[PDB]
């Protein structure tokens, strides 16, 4: 049907070539996955040699890494915001490798606040004191405050992330192939990559 051959097309000189044989089965191609945001729908295909391949049609959740902090957790996927290859892919919300996405900040915030014994995403005292202060302060015999200098002297996060945590969303990049692995999975944007894509997002519409 669809095929990926080299012989249907012309040579260096601009000259044509005539067909050598009928279409062979090892020259095959197949339609694209076009993965959307939505509750899990995966289908499987048999491939050359009798092996299996996984094709994701809908995904709602992924695995993401905050490489700066050595933390990775299972996280909800919210929206797609930039695509370097084609604007119709963000207009129709399709998920592919090196796409830029928004993810839920919550499991990183909960890891940080319990690891460093400090607040992160907080606005004012009404969202600090009335509950869950007992995550931050407890009885800690000979481990109370000064021994947390192992934590507190390296706790400060970049200003570009502290502005994202207060809105409840982080920017991330997809590293897996979702139409081939069945998974959407990647890493949190940081540093000069974060500066580059914030400029590109703002310069397109804002």
């Amino acid at each position: 049907g669809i095929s990926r051959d080299n012989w249907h097309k012309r040579r260096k000189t601009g000259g044509k070539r005539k067909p050598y044989h009928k279409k062979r089965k090892y020259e095959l191609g197949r339609p694209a996955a076009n993965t959307k945001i939505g509750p899990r729908r995966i289908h499987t295909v048999g491939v050359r040699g009798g092996n299996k391949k996984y094709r994701a049609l809908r995904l709602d959740v992924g695995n993401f890494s905050w490489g700066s902090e050595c933390c990775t957790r299972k996280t909800r996927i919210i929206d797609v915001v930039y695509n370097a290859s084609n604007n119709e892919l963000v207009r129709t919300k399709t998920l592919v490798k090196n796409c830029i996405v928004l993810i839920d900040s919550t499991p990183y915030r909960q890891w940080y606040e319990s690891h460093y014994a400090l607040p992160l995403g907080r606005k004012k005292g009404a969202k600090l004191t009335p509950e869950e202060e007992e995550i931050l302060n407890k009885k800690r015999s000979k481990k109370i405050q000064k021994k947390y200098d192992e934590r507190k002297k390296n706790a400060k996060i970049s200003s570009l992330l502290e502005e994202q945590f207060q809105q409840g969303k982080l920017l991330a990049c997809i590293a897996s192939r979702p139409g081939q692995c069945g998974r959407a999975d990647g890493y949190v944007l940081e540093g000069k990559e974060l500066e580059f894509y914030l400029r590109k997002i703002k310069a397109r519409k804002g």
Binding site: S68, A84, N154, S158, F196
Partner: protein, 158 residues
């Protein structure tokens, strides 16, 4: 030089990572990027401009994702209107055995030329080795450039 992110997607070397911890540098600073580079083997030497440079090129032999294997060849630089690729000419004699005499022939190759070579000119001599297919018509990559066994660029004092 001062900017390299001229594309719609961010440009970087794979296998290099930048720490977002212990970031203090005071009134001055140093390079946030270390450089990846490798030895090619076969008695070739890596150019200084690959180690001291800041360019991104995935098809580069010294700083990218290619393996040099099989045949090693040479030819004369003859055209360079494409970007990061050039055309070279190879000339030879063919024997026709009914007569006892030779015939002159040529072929052209398109080859990939990275930054780190930046003073090449038409009529220079270039050495190349095989790769995996790099594009539709490209199979070879530049390992060394020279102008030995010939006249100077400008006057004899060059």
């Amino acid at each position: 030089m001062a900017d390299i992110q001229t594309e719609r997607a961010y440009q970087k070397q794979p296998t290099i990572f930048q720490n977002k911890k212990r970031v203090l540098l005071g009134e001055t600073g140093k390079e946030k990027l270390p450089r990846y580079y490798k030895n090619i083997g076969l008695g070739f030497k890596t150019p200084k401009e690959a180690i001291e440079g800041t360019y991104i090129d995935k098809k580069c032999p010294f700083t990218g994702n290619v393996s040099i294997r099989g045949r090693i060849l040479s030819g004369v630089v003859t055209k360079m209107k494409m970007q990061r690729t050039i055309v070279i000419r190879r000339d030879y004699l063919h024997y026709i055995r009914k007569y006892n005499r030779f015939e002159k022939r040529h072929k052209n190759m398109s080859v990939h030329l990275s930054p780190c070579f930046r003073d090449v000119q038409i009529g220079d001599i270039v050495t190349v080795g095989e790769c995996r297919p790099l594009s539709k018509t490209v199979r070879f990559n530049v390992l060394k450039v020279t102008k030995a066994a010939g006249t100077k660029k400008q006057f004899q004092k060059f």
